[PDB]
PDB file of C-alpha atoms in Angstrom:
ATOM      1  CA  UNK A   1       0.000   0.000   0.000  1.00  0.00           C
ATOM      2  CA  UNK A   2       2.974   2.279  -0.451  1.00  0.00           C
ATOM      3  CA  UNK A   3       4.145   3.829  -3.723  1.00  0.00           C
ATOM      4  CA  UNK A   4       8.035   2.406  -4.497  1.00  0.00           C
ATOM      5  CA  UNK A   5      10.481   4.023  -6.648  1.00  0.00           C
ATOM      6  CA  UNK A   6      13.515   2.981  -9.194  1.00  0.00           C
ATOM      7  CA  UNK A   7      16.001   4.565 -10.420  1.00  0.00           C
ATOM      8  CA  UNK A   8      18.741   3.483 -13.071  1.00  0.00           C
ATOM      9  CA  UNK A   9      22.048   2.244 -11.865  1.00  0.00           C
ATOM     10  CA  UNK A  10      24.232   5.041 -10.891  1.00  0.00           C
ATOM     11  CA  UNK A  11      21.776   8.231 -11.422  1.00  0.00           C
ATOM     12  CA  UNK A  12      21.331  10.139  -7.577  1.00  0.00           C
ATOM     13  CA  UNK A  13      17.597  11.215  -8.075  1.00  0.00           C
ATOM     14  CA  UNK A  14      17.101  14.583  -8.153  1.00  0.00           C
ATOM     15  CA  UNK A  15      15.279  16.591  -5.247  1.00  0.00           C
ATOM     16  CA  UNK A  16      15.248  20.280  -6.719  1.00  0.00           C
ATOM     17  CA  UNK A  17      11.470  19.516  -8.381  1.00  0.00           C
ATOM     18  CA  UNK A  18       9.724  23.067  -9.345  1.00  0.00           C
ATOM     19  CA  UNK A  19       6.620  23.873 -10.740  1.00  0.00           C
ATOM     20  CA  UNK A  20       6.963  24.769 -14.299  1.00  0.00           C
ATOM     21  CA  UNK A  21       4.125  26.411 -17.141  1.00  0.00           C
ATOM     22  CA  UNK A  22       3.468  22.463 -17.918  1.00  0.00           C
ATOM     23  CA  UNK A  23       4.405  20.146 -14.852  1.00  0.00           C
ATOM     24  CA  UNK A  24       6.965  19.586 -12.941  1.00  0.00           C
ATOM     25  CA  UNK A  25      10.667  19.350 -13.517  1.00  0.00           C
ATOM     26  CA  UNK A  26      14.531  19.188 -12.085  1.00  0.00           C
ATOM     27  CA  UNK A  27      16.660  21.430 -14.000  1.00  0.00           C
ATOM     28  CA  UNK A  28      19.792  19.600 -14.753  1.00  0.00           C
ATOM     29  CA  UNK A  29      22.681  19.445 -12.133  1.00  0.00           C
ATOM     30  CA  UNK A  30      26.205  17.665 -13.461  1.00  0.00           C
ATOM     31  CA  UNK A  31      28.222  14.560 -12.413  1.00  0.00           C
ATOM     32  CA  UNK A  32      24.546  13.318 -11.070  1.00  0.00           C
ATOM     33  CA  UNK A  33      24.684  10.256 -13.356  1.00  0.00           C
ATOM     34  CA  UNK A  34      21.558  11.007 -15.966  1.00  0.00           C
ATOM     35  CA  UNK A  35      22.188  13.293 -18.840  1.00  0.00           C
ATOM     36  CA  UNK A  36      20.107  15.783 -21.002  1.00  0.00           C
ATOM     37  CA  UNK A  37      21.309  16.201 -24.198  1.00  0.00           C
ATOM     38  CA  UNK A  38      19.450  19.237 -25.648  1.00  0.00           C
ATOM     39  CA  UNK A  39      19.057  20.090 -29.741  1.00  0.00           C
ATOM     40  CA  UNK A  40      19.860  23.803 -30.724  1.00  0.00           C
ATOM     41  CA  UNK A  41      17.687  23.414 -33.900  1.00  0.00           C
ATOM     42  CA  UNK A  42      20.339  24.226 -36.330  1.00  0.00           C
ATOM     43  CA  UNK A  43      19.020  22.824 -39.080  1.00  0.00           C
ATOM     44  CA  UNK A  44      20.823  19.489 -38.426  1.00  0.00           C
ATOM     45  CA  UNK A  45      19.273  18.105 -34.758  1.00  0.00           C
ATOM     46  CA  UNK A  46      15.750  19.258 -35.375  1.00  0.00           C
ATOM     47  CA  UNK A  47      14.690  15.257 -36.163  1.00  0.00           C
ATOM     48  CA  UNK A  48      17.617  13.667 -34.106  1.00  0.00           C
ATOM     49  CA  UNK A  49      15.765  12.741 -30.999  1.00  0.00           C
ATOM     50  CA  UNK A  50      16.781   9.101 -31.037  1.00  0.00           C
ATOM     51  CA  UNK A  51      20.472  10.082 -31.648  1.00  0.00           C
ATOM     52  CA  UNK A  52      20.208  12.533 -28.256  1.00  0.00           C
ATOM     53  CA  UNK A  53      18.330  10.087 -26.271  1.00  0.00           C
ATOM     54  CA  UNK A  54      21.522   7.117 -27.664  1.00  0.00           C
ATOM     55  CA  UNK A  55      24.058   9.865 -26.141  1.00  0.00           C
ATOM     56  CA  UNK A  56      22.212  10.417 -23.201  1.00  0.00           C
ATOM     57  CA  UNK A  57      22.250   6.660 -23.024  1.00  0.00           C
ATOM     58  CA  UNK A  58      26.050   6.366 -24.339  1.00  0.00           C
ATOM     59  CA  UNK A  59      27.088   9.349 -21.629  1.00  0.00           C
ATOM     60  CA  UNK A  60      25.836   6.631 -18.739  1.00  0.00           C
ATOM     61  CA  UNK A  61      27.641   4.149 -20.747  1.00  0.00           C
ATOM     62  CA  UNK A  62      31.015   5.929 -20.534  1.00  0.00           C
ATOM     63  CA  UNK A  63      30.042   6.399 -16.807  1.00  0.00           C
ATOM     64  CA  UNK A  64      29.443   2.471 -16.567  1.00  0.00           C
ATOM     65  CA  UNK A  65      32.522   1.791 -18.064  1.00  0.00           C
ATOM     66  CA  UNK A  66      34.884   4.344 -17.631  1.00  0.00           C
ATOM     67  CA  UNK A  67      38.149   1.660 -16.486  1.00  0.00           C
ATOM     68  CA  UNK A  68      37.117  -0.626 -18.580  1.00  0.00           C
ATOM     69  CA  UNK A  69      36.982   2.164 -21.566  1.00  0.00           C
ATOM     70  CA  UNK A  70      40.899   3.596 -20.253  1.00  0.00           C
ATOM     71  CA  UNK A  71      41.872  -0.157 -20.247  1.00  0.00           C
ATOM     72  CA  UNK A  72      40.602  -0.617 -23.973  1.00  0.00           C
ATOM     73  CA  UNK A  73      41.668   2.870 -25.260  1.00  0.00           C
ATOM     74  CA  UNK A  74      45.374   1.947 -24.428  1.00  0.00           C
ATOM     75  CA  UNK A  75      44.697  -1.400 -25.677  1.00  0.00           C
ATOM     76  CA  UNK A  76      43.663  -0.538 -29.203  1.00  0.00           C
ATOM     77  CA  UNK A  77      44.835   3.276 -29.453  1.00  0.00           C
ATOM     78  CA  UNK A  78      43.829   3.356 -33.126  1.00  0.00           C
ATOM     79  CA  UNK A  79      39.589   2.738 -32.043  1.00  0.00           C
ATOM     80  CA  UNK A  80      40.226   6.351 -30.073  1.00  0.00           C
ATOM     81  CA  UNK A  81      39.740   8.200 -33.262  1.00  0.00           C
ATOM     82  CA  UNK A  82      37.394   8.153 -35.942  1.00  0.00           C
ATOM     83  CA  UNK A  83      39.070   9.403 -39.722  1.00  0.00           C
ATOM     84  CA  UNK A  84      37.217   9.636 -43.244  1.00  0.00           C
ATOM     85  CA  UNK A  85      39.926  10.188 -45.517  1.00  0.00           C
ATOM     86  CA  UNK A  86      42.690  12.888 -44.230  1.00  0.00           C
ATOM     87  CA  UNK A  87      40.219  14.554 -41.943  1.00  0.00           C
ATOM     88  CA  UNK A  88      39.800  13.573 -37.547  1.00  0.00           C
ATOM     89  CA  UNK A  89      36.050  13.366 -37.928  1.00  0.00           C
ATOM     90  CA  UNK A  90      35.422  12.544 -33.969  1.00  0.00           C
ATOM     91  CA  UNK A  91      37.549  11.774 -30.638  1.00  0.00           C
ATOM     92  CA  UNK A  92      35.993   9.227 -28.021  1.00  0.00           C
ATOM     93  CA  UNK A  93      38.154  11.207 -25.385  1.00  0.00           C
ATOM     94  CA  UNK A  94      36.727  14.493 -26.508  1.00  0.00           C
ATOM     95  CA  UNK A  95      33.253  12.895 -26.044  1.00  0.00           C
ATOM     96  CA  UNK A  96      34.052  11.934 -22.138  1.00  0.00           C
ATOM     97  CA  UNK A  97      35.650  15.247 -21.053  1.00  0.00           C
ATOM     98  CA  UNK A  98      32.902  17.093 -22.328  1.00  0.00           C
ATOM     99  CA  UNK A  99      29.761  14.260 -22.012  1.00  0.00           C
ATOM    100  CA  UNK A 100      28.169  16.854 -18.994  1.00  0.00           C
ATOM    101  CA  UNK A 101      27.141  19.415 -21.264  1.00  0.00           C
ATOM    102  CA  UNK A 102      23.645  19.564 -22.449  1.00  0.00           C
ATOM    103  CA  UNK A 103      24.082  21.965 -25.727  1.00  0.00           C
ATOM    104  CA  UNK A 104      27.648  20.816 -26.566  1.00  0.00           C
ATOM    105  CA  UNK A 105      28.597  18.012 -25.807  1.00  0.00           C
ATOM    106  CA  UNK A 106      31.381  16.479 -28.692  1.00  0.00           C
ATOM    107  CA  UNK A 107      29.285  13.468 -28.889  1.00  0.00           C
ATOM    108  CA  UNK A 108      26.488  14.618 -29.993  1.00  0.00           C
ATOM    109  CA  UNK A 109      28.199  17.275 -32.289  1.00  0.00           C
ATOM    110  CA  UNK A 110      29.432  13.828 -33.668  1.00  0.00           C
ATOM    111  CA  UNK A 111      25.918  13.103 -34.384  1.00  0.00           C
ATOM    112  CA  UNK A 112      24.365  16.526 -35.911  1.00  0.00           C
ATOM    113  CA  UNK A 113      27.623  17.293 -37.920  1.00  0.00           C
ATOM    114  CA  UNK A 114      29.753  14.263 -38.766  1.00  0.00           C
ATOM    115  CA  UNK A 115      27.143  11.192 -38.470  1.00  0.00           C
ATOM    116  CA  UNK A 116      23.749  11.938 -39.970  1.00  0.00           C
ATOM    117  CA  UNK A 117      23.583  15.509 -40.446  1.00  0.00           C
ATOM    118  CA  UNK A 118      21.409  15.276 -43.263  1.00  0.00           C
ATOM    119  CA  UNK A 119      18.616  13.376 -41.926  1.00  0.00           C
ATOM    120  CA  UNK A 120      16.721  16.153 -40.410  1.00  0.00           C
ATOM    121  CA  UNK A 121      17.087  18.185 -44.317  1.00  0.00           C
ATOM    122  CA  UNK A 122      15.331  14.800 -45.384  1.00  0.00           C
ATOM    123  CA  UNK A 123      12.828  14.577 -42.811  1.00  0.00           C
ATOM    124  CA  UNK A 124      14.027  11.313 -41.526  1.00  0.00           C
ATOM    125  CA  UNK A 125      15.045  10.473 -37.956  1.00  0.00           C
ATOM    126  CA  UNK A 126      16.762   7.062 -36.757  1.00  0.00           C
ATOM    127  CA  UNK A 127      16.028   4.766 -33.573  1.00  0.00           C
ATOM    128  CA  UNK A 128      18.364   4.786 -30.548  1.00  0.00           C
ATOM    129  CA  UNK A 129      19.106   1.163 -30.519  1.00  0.00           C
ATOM    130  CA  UNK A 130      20.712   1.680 -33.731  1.00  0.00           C
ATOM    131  CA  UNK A 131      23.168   4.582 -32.869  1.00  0.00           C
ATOM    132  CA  UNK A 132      24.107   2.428 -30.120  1.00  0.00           C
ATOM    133  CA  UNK A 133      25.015  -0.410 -32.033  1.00  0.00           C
ATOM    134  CA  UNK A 134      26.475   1.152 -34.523  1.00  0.00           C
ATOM    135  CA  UNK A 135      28.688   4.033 -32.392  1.00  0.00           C
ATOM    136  CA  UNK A 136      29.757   0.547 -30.083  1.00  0.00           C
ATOM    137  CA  UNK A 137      29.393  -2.716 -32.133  1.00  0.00           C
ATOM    138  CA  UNK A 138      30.161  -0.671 -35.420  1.00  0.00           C
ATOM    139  CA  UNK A 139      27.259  -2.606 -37.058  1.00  0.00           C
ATOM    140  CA  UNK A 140      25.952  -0.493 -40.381  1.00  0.00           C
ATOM    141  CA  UNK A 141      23.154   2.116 -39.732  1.00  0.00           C
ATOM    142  CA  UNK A 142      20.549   1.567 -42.637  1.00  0.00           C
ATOM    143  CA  UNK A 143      17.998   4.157 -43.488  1.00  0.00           C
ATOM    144  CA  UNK A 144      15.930   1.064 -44.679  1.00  0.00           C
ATOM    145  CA  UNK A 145      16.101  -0.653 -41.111  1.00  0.00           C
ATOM    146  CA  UNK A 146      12.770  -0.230 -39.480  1.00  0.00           C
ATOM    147  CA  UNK A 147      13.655  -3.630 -36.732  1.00  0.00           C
ATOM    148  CA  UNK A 148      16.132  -4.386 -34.654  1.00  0.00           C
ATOM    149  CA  UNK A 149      19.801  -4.604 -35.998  1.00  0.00           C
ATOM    150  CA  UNK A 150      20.356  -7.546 -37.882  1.00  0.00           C
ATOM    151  CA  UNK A 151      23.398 -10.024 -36.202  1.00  0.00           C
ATOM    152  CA  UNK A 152      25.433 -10.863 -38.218  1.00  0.00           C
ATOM    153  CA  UNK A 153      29.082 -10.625 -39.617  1.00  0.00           C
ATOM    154  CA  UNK A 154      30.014  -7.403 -41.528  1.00  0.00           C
ATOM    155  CA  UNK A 155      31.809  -4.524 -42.371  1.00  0.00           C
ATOM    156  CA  UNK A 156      32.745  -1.944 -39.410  1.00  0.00           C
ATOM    157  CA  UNK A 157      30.611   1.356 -40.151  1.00  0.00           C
ATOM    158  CA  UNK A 158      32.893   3.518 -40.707  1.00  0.00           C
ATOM    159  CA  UNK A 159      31.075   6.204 -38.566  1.00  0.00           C
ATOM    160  CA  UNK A 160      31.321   4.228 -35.285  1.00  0.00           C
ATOM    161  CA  UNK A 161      32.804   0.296 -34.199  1.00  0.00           C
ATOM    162  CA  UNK A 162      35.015   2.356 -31.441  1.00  0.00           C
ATOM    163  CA  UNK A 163      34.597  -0.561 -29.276  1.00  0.00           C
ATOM    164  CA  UNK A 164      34.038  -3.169 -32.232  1.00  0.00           C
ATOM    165  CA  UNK A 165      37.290  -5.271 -30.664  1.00  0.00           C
ATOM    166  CA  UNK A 166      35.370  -6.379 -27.547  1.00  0.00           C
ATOM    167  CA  UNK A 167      31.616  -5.683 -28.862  1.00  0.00           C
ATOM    168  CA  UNK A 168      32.067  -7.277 -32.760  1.00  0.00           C
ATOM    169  CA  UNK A 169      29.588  -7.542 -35.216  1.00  0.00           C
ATOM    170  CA  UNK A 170      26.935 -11.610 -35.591  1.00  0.00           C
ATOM    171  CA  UNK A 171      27.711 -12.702 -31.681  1.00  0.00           C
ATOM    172  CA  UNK A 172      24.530 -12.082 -29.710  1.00  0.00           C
ATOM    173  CA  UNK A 173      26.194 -12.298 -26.942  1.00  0.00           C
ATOM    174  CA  UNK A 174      28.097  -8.974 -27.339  1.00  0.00           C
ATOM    175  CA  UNK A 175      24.609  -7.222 -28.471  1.00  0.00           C
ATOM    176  CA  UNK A 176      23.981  -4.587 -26.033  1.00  0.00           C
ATOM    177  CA  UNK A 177      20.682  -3.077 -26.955  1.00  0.00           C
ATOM    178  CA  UNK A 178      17.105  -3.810 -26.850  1.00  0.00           C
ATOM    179  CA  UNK A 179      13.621  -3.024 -28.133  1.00  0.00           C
ATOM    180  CA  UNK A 180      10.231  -3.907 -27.173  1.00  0.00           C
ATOM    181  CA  UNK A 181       6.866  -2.641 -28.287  1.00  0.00           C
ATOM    182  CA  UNK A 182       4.178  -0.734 -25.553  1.00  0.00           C
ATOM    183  CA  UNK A 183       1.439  -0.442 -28.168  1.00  0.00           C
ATOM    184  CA  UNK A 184      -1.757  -2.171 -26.845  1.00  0.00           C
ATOM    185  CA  UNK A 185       0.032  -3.946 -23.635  1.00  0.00           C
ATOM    186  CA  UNK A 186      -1.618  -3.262 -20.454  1.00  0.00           C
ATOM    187  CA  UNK A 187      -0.435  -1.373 -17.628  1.00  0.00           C
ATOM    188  CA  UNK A 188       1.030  -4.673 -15.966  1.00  0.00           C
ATOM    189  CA  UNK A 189       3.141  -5.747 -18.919  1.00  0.00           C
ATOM    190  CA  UNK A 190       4.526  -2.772 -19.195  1.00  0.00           C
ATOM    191  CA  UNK A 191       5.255  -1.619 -15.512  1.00  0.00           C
ATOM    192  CA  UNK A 192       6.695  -5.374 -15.083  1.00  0.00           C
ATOM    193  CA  UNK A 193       8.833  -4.778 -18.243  1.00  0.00           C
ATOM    194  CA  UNK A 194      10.481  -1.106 -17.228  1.00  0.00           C
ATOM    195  CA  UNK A 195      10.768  -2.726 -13.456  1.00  0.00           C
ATOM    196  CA  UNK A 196      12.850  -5.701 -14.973  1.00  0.00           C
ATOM    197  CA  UNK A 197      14.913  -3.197 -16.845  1.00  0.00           C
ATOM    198  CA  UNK A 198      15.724  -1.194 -14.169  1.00  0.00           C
ATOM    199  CA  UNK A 199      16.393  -3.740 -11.450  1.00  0.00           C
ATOM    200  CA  UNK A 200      18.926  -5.174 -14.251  1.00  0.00           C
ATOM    201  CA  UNK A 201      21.000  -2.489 -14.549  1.00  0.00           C
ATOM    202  CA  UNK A 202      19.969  -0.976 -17.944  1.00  0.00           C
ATOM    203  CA  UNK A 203      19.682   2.400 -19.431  1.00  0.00           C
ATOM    204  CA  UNK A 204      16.144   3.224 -20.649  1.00  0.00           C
ATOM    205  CA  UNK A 205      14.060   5.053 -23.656  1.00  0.00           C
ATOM    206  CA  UNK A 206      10.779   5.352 -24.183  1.00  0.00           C
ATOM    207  CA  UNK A 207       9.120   6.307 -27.170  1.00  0.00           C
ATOM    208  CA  UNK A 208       5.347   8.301 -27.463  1.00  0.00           C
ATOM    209  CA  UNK A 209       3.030   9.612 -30.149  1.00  0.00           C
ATOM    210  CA  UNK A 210       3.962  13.252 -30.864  1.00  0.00           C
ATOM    211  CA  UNK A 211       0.925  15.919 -31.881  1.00  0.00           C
ATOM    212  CA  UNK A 212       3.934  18.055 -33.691  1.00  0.00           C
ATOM    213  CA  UNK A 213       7.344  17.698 -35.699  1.00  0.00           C
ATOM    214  CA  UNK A 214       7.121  13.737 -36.231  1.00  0.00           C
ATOM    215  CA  UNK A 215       4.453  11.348 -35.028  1.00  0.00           C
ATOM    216  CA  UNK A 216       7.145   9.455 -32.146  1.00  0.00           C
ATOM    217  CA  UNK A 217       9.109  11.194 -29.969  1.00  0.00           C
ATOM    218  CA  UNK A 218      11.952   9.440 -27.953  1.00  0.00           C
ATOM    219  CA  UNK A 219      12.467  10.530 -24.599  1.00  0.00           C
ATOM    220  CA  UNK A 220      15.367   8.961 -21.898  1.00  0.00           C
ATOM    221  CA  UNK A 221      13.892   7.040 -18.568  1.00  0.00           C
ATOM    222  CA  UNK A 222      15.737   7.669 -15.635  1.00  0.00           C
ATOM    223  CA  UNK A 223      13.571   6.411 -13.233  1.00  0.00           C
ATOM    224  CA  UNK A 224       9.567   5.334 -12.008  1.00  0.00           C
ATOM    225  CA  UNK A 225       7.413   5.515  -9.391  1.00  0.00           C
ATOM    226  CA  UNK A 226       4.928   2.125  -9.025  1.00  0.00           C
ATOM    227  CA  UNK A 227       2.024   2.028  -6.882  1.00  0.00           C
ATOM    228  CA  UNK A 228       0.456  -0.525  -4.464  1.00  0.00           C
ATOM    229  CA  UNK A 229      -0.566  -2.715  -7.135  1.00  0.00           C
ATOM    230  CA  UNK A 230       3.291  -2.632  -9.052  1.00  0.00           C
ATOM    231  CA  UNK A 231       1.876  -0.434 -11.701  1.00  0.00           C
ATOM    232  CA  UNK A 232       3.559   2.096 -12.547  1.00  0.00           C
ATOM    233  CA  UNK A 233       2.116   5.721 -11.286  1.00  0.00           C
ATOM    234  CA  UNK A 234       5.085   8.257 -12.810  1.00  0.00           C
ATOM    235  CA  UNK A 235       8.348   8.102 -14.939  1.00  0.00           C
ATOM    236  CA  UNK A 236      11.038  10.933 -14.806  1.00  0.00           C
ATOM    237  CA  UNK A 237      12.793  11.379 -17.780  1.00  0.00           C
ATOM    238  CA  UNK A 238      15.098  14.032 -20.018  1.00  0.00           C
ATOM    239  CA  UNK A 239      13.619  15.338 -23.352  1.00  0.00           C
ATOM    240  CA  UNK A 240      16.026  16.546 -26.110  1.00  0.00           C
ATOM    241  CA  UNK A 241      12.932  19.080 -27.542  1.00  0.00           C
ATOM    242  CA  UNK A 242      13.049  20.428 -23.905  1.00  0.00           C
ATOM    243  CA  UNK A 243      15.666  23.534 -23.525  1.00  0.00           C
ATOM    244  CA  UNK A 244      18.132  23.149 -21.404  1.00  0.00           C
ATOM    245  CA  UNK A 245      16.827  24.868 -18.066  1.00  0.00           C
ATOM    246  CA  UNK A 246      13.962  22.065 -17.627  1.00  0.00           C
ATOM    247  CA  UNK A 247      16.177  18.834 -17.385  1.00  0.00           C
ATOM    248  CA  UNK A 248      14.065  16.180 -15.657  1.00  0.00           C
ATOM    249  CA  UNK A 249      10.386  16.244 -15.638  1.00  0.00           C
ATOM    250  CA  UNK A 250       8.000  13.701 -14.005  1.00  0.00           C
ATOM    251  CA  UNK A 251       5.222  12.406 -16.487  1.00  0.00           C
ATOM    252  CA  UNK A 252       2.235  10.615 -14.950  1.00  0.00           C
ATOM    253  CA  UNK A 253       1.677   6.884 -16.602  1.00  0.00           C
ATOM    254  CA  UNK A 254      -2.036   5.953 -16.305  1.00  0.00           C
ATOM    255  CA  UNK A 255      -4.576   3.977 -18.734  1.00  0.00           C
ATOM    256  CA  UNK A 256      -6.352   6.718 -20.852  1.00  0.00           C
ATOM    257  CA  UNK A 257     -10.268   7.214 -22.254  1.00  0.00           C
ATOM    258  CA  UNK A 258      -9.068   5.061 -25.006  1.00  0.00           C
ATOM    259  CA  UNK A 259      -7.626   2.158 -23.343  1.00  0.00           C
ATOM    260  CA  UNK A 260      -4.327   2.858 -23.911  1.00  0.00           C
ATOM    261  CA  UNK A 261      -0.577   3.365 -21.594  1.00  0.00           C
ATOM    262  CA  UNK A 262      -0.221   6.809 -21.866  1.00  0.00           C
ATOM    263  CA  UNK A 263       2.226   9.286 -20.072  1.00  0.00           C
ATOM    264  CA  UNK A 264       1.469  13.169 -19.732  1.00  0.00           C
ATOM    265  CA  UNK A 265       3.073  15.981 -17.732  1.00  0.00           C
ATOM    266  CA  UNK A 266      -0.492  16.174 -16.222  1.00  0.00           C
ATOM    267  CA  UNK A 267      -2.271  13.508 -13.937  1.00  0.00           C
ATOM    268  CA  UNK A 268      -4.046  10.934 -16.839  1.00  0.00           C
ATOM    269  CA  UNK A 269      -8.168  11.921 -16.943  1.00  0.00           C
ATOM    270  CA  UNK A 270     -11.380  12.238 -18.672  1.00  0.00           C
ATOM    271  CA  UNK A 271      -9.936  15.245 -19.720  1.00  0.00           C
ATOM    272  CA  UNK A 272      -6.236  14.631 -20.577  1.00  0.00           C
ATOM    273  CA  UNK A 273      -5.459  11.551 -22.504  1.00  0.00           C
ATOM    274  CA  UNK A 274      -1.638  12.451 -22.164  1.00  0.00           C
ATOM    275  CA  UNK A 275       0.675  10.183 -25.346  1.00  0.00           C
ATOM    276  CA  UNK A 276       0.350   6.209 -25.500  1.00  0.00           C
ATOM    277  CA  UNK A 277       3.469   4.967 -25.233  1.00  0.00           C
ATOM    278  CA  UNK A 278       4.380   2.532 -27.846  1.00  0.00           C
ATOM    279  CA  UNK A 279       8.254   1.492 -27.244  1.00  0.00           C
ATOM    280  CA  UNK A 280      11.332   0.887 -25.009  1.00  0.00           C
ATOM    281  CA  UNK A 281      15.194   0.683 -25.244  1.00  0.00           C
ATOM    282  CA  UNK A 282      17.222  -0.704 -23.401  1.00  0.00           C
ATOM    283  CA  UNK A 283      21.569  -0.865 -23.079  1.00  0.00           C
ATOM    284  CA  UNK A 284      23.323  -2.749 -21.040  1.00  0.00           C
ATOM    285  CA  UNK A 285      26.623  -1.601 -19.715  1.00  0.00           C
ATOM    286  CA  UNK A 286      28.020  -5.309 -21.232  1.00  0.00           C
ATOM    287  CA  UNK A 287      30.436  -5.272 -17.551  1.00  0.00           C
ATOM    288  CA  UNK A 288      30.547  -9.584 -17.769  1.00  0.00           C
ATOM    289  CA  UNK A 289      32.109  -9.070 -21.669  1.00  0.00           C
ATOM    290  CA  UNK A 290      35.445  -7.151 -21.106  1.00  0.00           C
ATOM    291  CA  UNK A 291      38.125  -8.724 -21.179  1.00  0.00           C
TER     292      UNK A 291
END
């Protein structure tokens, strides 16, 4: 009869909740453990919510990992740079020291400028499980993929593979992502599902219909609030469309008017039908594979 709480491995909650013009938020506060990766619009993030919410991800990730990552680095110095041609195109060093800020961080400069900064010109996005998997595993980032990554042997993609000698390419094993669909599951299914995560030690992303730019937006899950019953009651999470003074807001999750999971800055109603949720990613820090 009392309403727990979970966080993601190695993010301190934060306590400095205020009021804001539509619900409630935590402006961001560094070296916390959760990030908020926030688009300028520049012409070049504008669609590249999934490739925010996979540094957001990727910035826990380096957190995770951050011996293991030195150890590797000095290992294999030539997977600390990334080159096309004559040109230094991206530094994975570059991307730590700087993986705090929310407007400009290297990594997701990487991202906007380097890795897919046409996509929002073309009004195409990506999914986050894919940046991960290529920026990690190096496997290929097709505009034609719609699914999870295929795994399978193949050529390093030339835009990521940094850590492609521990994480390679067709061993499912070494996979570190995840997807599942939310459309049309019930409350249950999906509070047991983001509880499972969580207790496991993932990093989390959820994904919602959008009534603007797109029609899904990807947002990072930090952590959730389930009631009496296990459901769950609230998620806090970081929103690259946010700018960056809001940092972590607190959606309520309920069951909507039209049957479906839906979260909203507001309390779920009659009169507020808040966005169904319709997927979840997941990555794994990968700590049993190193080595």
């Amino acid at each position: 009869q009392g309403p727990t709480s979970i966080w993601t491995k190695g993010v301190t909650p934060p306590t400095n909740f205020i009021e804001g013009t539509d619900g409630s938020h935590a402006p961001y506060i560094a070296n916390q453990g959760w990030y908020d990766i926030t688009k300028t619009f520049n012409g070049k993030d504008d669609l590249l919510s999934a490739a925010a919410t996979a540094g957001n991800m990727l910035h826990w990730w380096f957190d995770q990992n951050k011996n293991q990552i030195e150890g590797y680095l000095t290992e294999h110095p030539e997977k600390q740079a990334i080159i096309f041609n004559g040109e230094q195109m991206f530094d994975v060093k570059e991307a730590i020291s700087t993986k705090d800020r929310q407007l400009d961080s290297k990594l997701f400069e990487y991202f906007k400028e380097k890795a897919f900064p046409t996509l929002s010109a073309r009004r195409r996005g990506v999914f986050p499980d894919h940046v991960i998997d290529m920026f990690i595993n190096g496997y290929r980032l097709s505009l034609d993929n719609y699914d999870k990554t295929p795994v399978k042997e193949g050529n390093k993609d030339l835009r990521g593979g940094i850590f492609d000698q521990v994480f390679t390419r067709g061993d499912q094993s070494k996979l570190l992502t995840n997807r599942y669909n939310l459309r049309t599951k019930t409350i249950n299914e999906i509070s047991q599902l983001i509880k499972q995560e969580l207790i496991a030690g993932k990093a989390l992303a959820i994904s919602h219909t959008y009534n603007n730019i797109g029609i899904s937006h990807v947002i990072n899950l930090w952590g959730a609030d389930f009631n009496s019953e296990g459901n769950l009651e609230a998620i806090y999470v970081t929103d690259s469309d946010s700018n960056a003074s809001i940092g972590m807001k607190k959606y309520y999750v309920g069951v909507n008017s039209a049957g479906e999971v839906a979260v909203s800055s507001k309390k779920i109603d009659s009169e507020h039908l808040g966005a169904a949720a319709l997927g979840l990613y997941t990555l794994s820090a990968g700590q049993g594979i190193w080595h």
